Amino acid sequence: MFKAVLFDLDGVITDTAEYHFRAWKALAEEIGINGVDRQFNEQLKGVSREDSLQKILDLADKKVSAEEFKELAKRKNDNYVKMIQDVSPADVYPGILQLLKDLRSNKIKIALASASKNGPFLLERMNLTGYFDAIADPAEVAASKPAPDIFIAAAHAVGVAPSESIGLEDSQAGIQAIKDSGALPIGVGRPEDLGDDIVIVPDTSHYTLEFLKEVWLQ
Ligand SMILES: O=P(O)(O)OC[C@H]1O[C@@H](O)[C@H](O)[C@@H](O)[C@@H]1O
Numbered sequence: 001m002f003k004a005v006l007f008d009l010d011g012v013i014t015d016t017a018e019y020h021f022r023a024w025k026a027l028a029e030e031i032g033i034n035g036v037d038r039q040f041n042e043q044l045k046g047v048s049r050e051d052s053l054q055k056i057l058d059l060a061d062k063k064v065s066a067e068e069f070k071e072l073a074k075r076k077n078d079n080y081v082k083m084i085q086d087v088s089p090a091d092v093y094p095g096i097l098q099l100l101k102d103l104r105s106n107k108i109k110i111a112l113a114s115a116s117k118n119g120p121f122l123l124e125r126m127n128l129t130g131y132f133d134a135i136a137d138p139a140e141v142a143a144s145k146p147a148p149d150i151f152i153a154a155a156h157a158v159g160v161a162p163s164e165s166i167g168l169e170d171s172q173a174g175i176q177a178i179k180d181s182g183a184l185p186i187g188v189g190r191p192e193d194l195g196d197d198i199v200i201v202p203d204t205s206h207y208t209l210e211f212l213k214e215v216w217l218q
Pocket residue numbers: 009010017020044045046047048049052077114115116117118119171
């Protein structure tokens with residue numbers, strides 16, 4: 001049986017992928033780049049703060065100074081941090097709280113594999129911190145999503161091999177990161193965004209321990 005579940009946060013635990021999108025789109029438009037629509041944003045989900053900004057600059061073949069780059073990433077983060085202040089337990093996605101409880105009752109480890117430096121603050125906003133056996137610090141890994149390092153680190157922090165773990169993700173980058181870690185991915189979202197080659201569920205209510213077992217058994 002699997003021995004750990006490795007959680008993405010944004011778009012899996014709560015709807016903060018929407019806030020990252022809105023914030024990045026606002027930033028892009030401030031600098032005259034209009035191409036960050038929902039379709040483009042599928043390329044940004046799961047991607048680090050700096051890599052996200054660089055993808056937006058590349059979309060436009062735009063070059064900025066190092067000083068401006070740093071200011072822009074900070075500007076987006078300051079806006080995003082203001083957006084999430086009122087996140088509460090009521091914003092936890094359906095199924096997720098019960099899943100955490102069920103996992104703990106069945107002695108399955110719980111680790112956060114989020115790229116977001118805002119992850120710990122968000123788990124505290126949602127009263128979820130006490131469910132987690134570990135939070136992998138995204139500043140400690142040498143390579144960010146789609147590299148597998150953060151999933152590998154999450155699994156290590158809880159003493160479980162990646163091959164005996166399930167990863168939950170809403171993003172193309174993150175699904176690839178789970179694949180290359182050796183964990184089993186279960187995606188949440190549209191198959192047209194996330195692919196036809198892994199198990200995908202349409203919403204997080206589908207993330208029950210019963211289903212994770214159903215999937216693990218094959
Ligand atoms: O800027 P932060 O909070 O460190 O987040 C890094 C990222 O964290 C990921 O969880 C999000 O999917 C991305 O959209 C994002 O850019």
